[PDB]
Amino acid sequence: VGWGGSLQLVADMIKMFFKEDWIPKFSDRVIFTLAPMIAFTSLLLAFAIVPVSPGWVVADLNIGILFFLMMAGLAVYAVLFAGWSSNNKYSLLGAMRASAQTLSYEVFLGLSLMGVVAQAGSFNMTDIVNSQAHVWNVIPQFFGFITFAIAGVAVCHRHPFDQPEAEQELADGYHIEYSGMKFGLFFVGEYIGIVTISALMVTLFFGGWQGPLLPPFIWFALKTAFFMMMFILIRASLPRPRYDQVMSFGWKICLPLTLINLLVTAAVIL
Amino acid sequence: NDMVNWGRKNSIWPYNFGLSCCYVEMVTSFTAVHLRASPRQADLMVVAGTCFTKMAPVIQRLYDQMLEPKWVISMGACANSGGMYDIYSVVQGVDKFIPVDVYIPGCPPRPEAYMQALMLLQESIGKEQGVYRANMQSERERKRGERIAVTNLRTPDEI
Amino acid sequence: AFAIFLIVAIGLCCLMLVGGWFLGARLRLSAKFYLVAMFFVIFDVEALYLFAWSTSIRESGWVGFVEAAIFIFVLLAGLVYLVRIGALDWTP
Amino acid sequence: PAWQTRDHLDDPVIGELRNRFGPDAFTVQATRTGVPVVWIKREQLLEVGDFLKKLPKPYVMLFDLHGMDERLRTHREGLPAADFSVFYHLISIDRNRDIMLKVALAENDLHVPTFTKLFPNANWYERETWDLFGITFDGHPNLRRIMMPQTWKGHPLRKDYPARATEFSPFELTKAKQDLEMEALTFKPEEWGMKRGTENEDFMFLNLGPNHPSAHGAFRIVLQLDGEEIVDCVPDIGYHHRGAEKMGERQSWHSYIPYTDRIEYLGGCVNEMPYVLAVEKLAGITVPDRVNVIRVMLSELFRINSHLLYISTFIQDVGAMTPVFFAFTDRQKIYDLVEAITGFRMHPAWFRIGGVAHDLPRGWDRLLREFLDWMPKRLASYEKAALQNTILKGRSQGVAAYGAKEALEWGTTGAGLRATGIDFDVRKARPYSGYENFDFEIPVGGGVSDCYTRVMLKVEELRQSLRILEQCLNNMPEGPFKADHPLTTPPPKERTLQHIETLITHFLQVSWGPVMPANESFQMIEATKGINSYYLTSDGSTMSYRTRVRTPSFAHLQQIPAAIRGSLVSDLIVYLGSIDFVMSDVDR
Ligand code: SF4
């Protein structure tokens, strides 16, 4: 039997390859093609700001945070041009409600990230990775960390569980009208999304490149693997939350939590 | 190279269209072998149950929706042919209007029959026409000397 | 650098798309109520002041925390206002 | 004997009807149904029904409405001259009695006044009569074809219509292109029911056909939407019509038995029990006690299986499905006992006319005892998991509730009807198969029928079934598994293999079929869902002349639009899940 977990994804990717592509009649063509890469390239270039190594840094630019937020905001357009390219009022309204809850739950990540970038005081990732030298920026900001966790798992990572189905009738999940390689593009996009959110979480909240007794790049890789396994454990444990309950525990509960988080960090930093 | 064939053997996506009856055994099979199956995404459609005259257009639209490489497994005697219901309201087999590749007799078939259907269907997918001059070998002919050599069976007054 | 990675990414996009080609009126009550997303459009602009704030806070000090508390208190008052009037509720 | 042909003319209802209407109109048939069958010209149907509805102990529930062809019956002693007939089976619960009314019709004037005004649930039944026969019911609100498509010419239950698909043209795809053209142009003519609302921007027409899981088969429920409200819901049923009733006319008494197993896929031997009971009532066969206890054992096992399936699916759809998936393994264990007895997991086809196919193998008692000691701890784990849970209990209260009167008028029987205050079981009112020597209770919900009441009642009935099954394990007596009578079909096989007269009886019984004398029988039982009955008419031949199968699920699915009117789509789906309906049962 197959001994590797990834070999299933390998066979799936091969399968999505070499599949005939059909043209949809009475449909726009540019957005039908462009909606996948707005979801794919965004979290692909979200990987361009990680300090994987001082000597093998992918990009030594001065600002990486704003690029991440720019991709976070851009991601919605993929669900919106997918909704309009569905050309079915059911599916279109399904993608409209999915983008609704998306914009609703994407609010929190910037305000949660303000705490760590304020105690870091810089946008260049070398300053953040040099800040976690003795004390990591996770002990004081428990609330900010969990709020960023909720926001990161809320961006089309299947935790809401309203993507391929709809709790509300008269509408349908927006992954139906794409069936060629674009569907494999969706899966690879969420895969690079989850691994890049995990990498950004480890390198921005915890301490990357520490190396207590072993070389620090494999220390980063193993810690990222532990957080990968914990993310998968809680994603599986997390049940599907209906649309209502998600709207109830959204803007009400975590906007005050992050506002008092900013108050706490601003009060303790001076 | 034939890597594409390995790709198609290794991974397949099943579209479960089981009807009123005969789907409880299919569920018994699916919950052991495996919300992933989605319309317009699968390349395998396991037609089970009695294909009724009224709902046959539904099966024809679902057949039209899937991509060019289409595989179909007929399960049960009610889907291979009309089965026991040779009546005005039952079509005499699903092969009348869609091409079929594998036929799984029974009423209802067993989950192990579904497992052997996946094994014979990856075996067929690994020899490419589609017949390829290899599918003339039949289970009637392959295990014939196995089945004829059977002499004794347990008496049916025991558990 | 970033430019090299961007060129690599766009070249991969061109390679996959070219390879793919070679491989071969009235809604009535439905929809509407996007105004939560409009609340996001305005609230992101509110939080953009905190986006600019978060870079320089050590030199800001006590009046900075004071007027940031006033700012988020105004936002909290507006939020509870929208909740209590019934604007922010169950939505289609 | 309890099978002898009686007229029931002495019954008090016969004398009350004789006093009110005097003489004439009434012809008292002689049958073995146990109930009074009366013929009533079509000009008195509404009078008779109205009088019976208000009679000092009224017939509150219309059990059945269907038609009979009757054209080819040579044995017609005592009946009036009829070329067609329509029968109406009514039941008085306060009398625990039934009455059957037959209206005779001639071939040139197939017209009868509609009965829906007294009992609304008759509407679809009359619609079926328009579909399967060609009787037009004047005064019917929506008289359309309910089983075949709207362009199907011919009435399939006429005897001049060829029964089998072979006599028609094969699937040449001549109709696939026309059905495709029709389906592509999906528009509403406003003929799908009343459709009071017009087709404009004000009202939206949505097929709303659930193809998702737990739907219990694929069906459509055309819905009119205004403000996301259920303005009018019209089900489109008949997709799973297999023509079982028509099939009954062209099969012998013995070879039809497999078809009974597929009226309800989950019922199994419960579906066979009424058929064998009716055939043995025609034969005049009294079975031994061992046959009775064996039949009770198999029926309580299948009933337990059905109750466990309903509980499992309900807890999974509106609650936490993590623990209850162990019941799936338990269902496999129940199956290993069934295929230990009968042979095959589903569709056992094990009951025979006069008995069962074989005796129990000698290791049956240890397996049943192991299942009976093992099950109660799991049953109490489900009892704590379901009585004490709060989330679904709070969610599942007052969700499209109705009362006793509402259940009575809509013909709804079973857990739905037991959820109201009417204490009516057939195993106590009309004991059959030796239930009268056992002690079990009928739980009842009070006056409100909802999902919590239904599951609590189903658990209590499962406990009573387990008490019956242990009493069957501890008091199984000794003796034969087949009655001693020339019409016991088949004979004991060891006797067939050695004795010439038994071999000849077996030869003609399995080849031409047993000759049952011309008479009409009728049996109803408590099924896994509601009350299921079989009305069989024989013309003296080896095949049934008319087979009528009353399934309660048809009524349960017909009732939803009356109660769910004024609710959301989510409440609709929850109600559809709650109601005990299976598509195979609705379309027979
Ligand atoms: S094959 Fe058997 S179980 Fe399946 S639908 Fe036909 S009769 Fe029912």
What is each CA distance from D510 to C68, D131, D344, in whole angstroms?
93, 35, 22
Q: Two tokens at C68?
A: 């940031």
Helix (H, G, I), strand (E, B) or coil at D341: helix
The answer to whether A49 and A59 are in contact (CB under 8 A) is: yes
Whether B66 is in the pocket of ligand 1, judged by its Cβ within 6 Å, is no
Q: State how far the Cα of A188 lies from the Cα of A175, in Å rounded to an integer.
A: 14
Q: Which of A49, A68, A99, A111 to mutate to test the interface with C (most CBs of C within 10 A)?
A: A111
Amino acid identity for residue A22 in this structure: W
Please list, in sequence order, all residues whose beta carbon lies within 8 angstroms of the beta carbon of residue D106, skipping any fewer than 6 positions away: D82, D83, D84
Q: State how far the Cα of D148 lies from the Cα of D154, in Å rounded to an integer.
A: 10
- The string over C32-63, giving b where at least 16 C-beta atoms fall within 10 Å of a residue's C-beta and e elsewhere, is eebebbebbeebbeebeebbebbeebeebeee
Q: Which of D198, D199, D201 to mutate to test the interface with C (most CBs of C within 10 A)?
A: D201
Whether B51 is in the pocket of ligand 1, judged by its Cβ within 6 Å, is no
DSSP string covering D447-516, please? S-B-HHHHHHHHHHHHHHHHHHHHHHHHS---S-SB--STT-SSPPHHHHTT-HHHHHHHHHHHHT----
Q: Two tokens at A46?
A: 């979200």
The answer to whether D163 and D152 are in contact (CB under 8 A) is: no
Please list, in sequence order, all residues whose beta carbon lies within 8 angstroms of the beta carbon of residue B43, skipping any fewer than 6 positions away: B12, B13, B66, B67, B69, B70, B71
Q: State how far the Cα of A249 lies from the Cα of A255, in Å rounded to an integer.
A: 10
Contacting B residues, span 6-65, partner chain D, CB-CB under 8 Å: 19-22, 24-25, 28, 31, 50, 52, 54-58, 60-61
Run of H or E residues at D307 = helix D289-317
For chain C, the three-class secondary structure string (H helix, E strand, C coil) is CHHHHHHHHHHHHHHHHHHHHHHCCCCCCCCCCCHHHHHHHHHHHHHHHHHHHCCCCCCCCHHHHHHHHHHHHHHHHHHHHHHHHCCCCCCC
Q: How many angstroms separate the CA of residue A11 from the nearest CA in chain B?
A: 5
**CB count in 10 Å sphere of residue A160:** 20
Contacting A residues, span 155-184, partner chain D, CB-CB under 8 Å: 169-170
Experimental method: cryo-EM
Specify whether domain B1-149 bears CATH 3.40.190.100.
Answer: no
Q: State how far the Cα of A98 lies from the Cα of A167, in Å rounded to an integer.
A: 11
Q: State how far the Cα of B48 lies from the Cα of B104, in Å rounded to an integer.
A: 10
Q: Which of A13, A162, A167, A179 to mutate to test the interface with B (most CBs of B within 10 A)?
A: A179
Q: Two tokens at D525?
A: 């039982």
Count of domains forming chain C: 1
Q: Which residue has the tokens 């699937």?
A: D171
The answer to whether B57 and B51 are in contact (CB under 8 A) is: no
Domain residue ranges of chain B, discontinuous segments joined by +: 1-149
| D202 chain-C contacts, CB cut-off 8 A | 28
Q: Is the dihedral of CA D506, D510, D515, D518 positive or negative?
A: positive
Please provide residue D204's backbone torsions phi and psi, each rounded to the nearest 5 degrees. -110, 130
Q: Is the dihedral of CA D179, D183, D188, D193 positive or negative?
A: positive
How many angstroms does the Cα of residue D440 sit away from the middle of ligand 1?
Answer: 35
What is each CA distance from C26 to A99, C30, D149, D201, D324, in whole angstroms?
22, 9, 32, 7, 46
| D201 chain-C contacts, CB cut-off 8 A | 26, 28
**Residue D129 in domain:** yes
Structural domain boundaries, residue C66: 1-91
Please provide residue A233's backbone torsions phi and psi, each rounded to the nearest 5 degrees. -65, -40
CATH code of C10's domain: 1.20.58.1610
Q: State how far the Cα of D329 lies from the Cα of D338, in Å rounded to an integer.
A: 15
Counting Cβ atoms within 10 Å, is residue B40 exposed (0-12), middle (13-18) or buried (19+)?
middle
What is each CA distance from D55 to B152, D17, D405, D409, D421, in whole angstroms?
68, 10, 17, 16, 21
Nearest to A97 by CA among A119, A74, A80: A80
How many angstroms does the Cα of residue B15 sit away from the middle of ligand 1?
Answer: 18
- The string over D121-141, giving b where at least 16 C-beta atoms fall within 10 Å of a residue's C-beta and e elsewhere, is bbbbbbbbbbbbbebebeebe
What is each CA distance from C62 to A117, A267, C76, D63, in whole angstroms?
19, 8, 21, 83
Q: What share of chain D is helix, strand, coil (3-state, %, to 5)?
A: 40, 15, 45
Structural domain boundaries, residue D49: 12-138
CATH code of D330's domain: 1.10.645.10
Q: Which subunits have 3 or more CB–CB pairs within 8 Å of chain C? A: A, D
The answer to whether D142 and D76 are in contact (CB under 8 A) is: no
Whether B109 is in the pocket of ligand 1, judged by its Cβ within 6 Å, is no
| Residue that finishes a domain, picked among D138, D161, D181 | D138
Q: State how far the Cα of D406 lies from the Cα of D563, in Å rounded to an integer.
A: 9
Q: Touching check for D570 and chain A: CB below 8 Å?
A: yes
Amino acid identity for residue D202 in this structure: D
Tell me how far the alpha carbon of residue D448 is from its chain's centroid.
Answer: 24
Tell me how far the alpha carbon of residue C75 is from its chain's centroid.
Answer: 16
The answer to whether D322 and D480 are in contact (CB under 8 A) is: no
- The string over B123-139, giving b where at least 16 C-beta atoms fall within 10 Å of a residue's C-beta and e elsewhere, is ebbeeeeeeeeeeeeee
| C13 chain-A contacts, CB cut-off 8 A | 37, 41
**Residue D501 in domain:** yes
**Residue D119 in domain:** yes
Q: Two tokens at D458?
A: 């189903």
Nearest to C44 by CA among D344, A133, A111, D208: A111
Q: What is the DSSP letter of D42?
A: G
Q: Which subunits have 3 or more CB–CB pairs within 8 Å of chain A? A: B, C, D
Q: Is B51 annotated as a binding residue?
A: no
Q: How many angstroms separate the CA of residue D465 from the nearest CA in chain B?
A: 24
Counting Cβ atoms within 10 Å, is residue D474 exposed (0-12), middle (13-18) or buried (19+)?
exposed
Amino acid identity for residue B152 in this structure: N
Q: Two tokens at D539?
A: 């013309």
The answer to whether D124 and D99 are in contact (CB under 8 A) is: no
DSSP string covering A67-125, please? HHHHHHHHTHHHHHHHHHHH--HHHHHHHHHHHHHHHHHTSHHHHHHHHHHHHH--SSH
Whether B18 is in the pocket of ligand 1, judged by its Cβ within 6 Å, is no
What is each CA distance from A194 to A198, A231, D120, in whole angstroms?
6, 9, 58
How many angstroms does the Cα of residue B97 sit away from the middle of ligand 1?
Answer: 20
**CB count in 10 Å sphere of residue D283:** 22
| C29 chain-D contacts, CB cut-off 8 A | 227-228
**Backbone breaks in chain D (C–N > 2.5 Å) follow which residues?**
none
| Residue that finishes a domain, picked among D138, D168, D191 | D138
Please list, in sequence order, all residues whose beta carbon lies within 8 angstroms of the beta carbon of residue C46, skipping any fewer than 6 positions away: C71, C75
Run of H or E residues at D310 = helix D289-317
Q: Is the dihedral of CA A154, A157, A163, A167 positive or negative?
A: negative
